[PDB]
Design an enzyme around this catalytic site. Sequence first.
Site, PDB file in Angstrom:
ATOM      1  CD  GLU A 130      -1.207   0.312   3.704  1.00  0.00           C
ATOM      2  OE1 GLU A 130      -1.938   1.319   3.627  1.00  0.00           O
ATOM      3  OE2 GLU A 130      -1.247  -0.484   4.669  1.00  0.00           O
ATOM      4  CG  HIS A 149      -8.681   4.489   7.639  1.00  0.00           C
ATOM      5  ND1 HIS A 149      -8.753   4.223   8.989  1.00  0.00           N
ATOM      6  CD2 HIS A 149      -7.361   4.600   7.349  1.00  0.00           C
ATOM      7  CE1 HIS A 149      -7.531   4.174   9.494  1.00  0.00           C
ATOM      8  NE2 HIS A 149      -6.669   4.400   8.519  1.00  0.00           N
TER       9      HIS A 149
END
Lengths: 90, 108
Positions: free
Chosen positions: B71, B100
């Site tokens: 990520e 998120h």
Amino acid sequence: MKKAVINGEQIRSISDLHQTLKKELALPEYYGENLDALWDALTGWVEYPLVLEWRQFEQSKQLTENGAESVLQVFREAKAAGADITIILS
Amino acid sequence: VINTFDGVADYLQTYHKLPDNYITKSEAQALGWVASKGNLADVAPGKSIGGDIFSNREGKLPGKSGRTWREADINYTSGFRNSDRILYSSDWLIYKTTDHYQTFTKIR
């Protein structure tokens, strides 16, 4: 030196657990309330040293159907990763 | 500094790596970064966190034997980190999240 408390007998949902963590850990308002959001918060937001006191773990393990275990697992991995986290299971 | 969804996505596909303005959590730390301080921009100007292994803990992204996910922060400039992330796999599947990690969208 951040302190966080979880009274297990009062957790009736996995959501209860995530909202409780949001408050006790001072997570961002956008906190995803999921395992991936939790890992990111413990490793790129939360303040250390951190002390997590989880009371009545067993009771909260029931009302979250082993979800509590997955949450605890993230704290432990964050710990093994280098995070200064002390976990109290009572 | 390339830190937009399509800028980083195209870059990952074309060069099989993140742009130079990205550093891992451990690298940022070695530079003095303290997440709770939100000092990343102070310790490493123009840098954004990215490159770390993504464990796909909720099993939302497509898992396959041999595929690892990573990520990177998107739209970050300075201060505290936001809720945007680009997710890329070893075989180059690209996804994004802006909430998120609650939900993901495949972009490549």
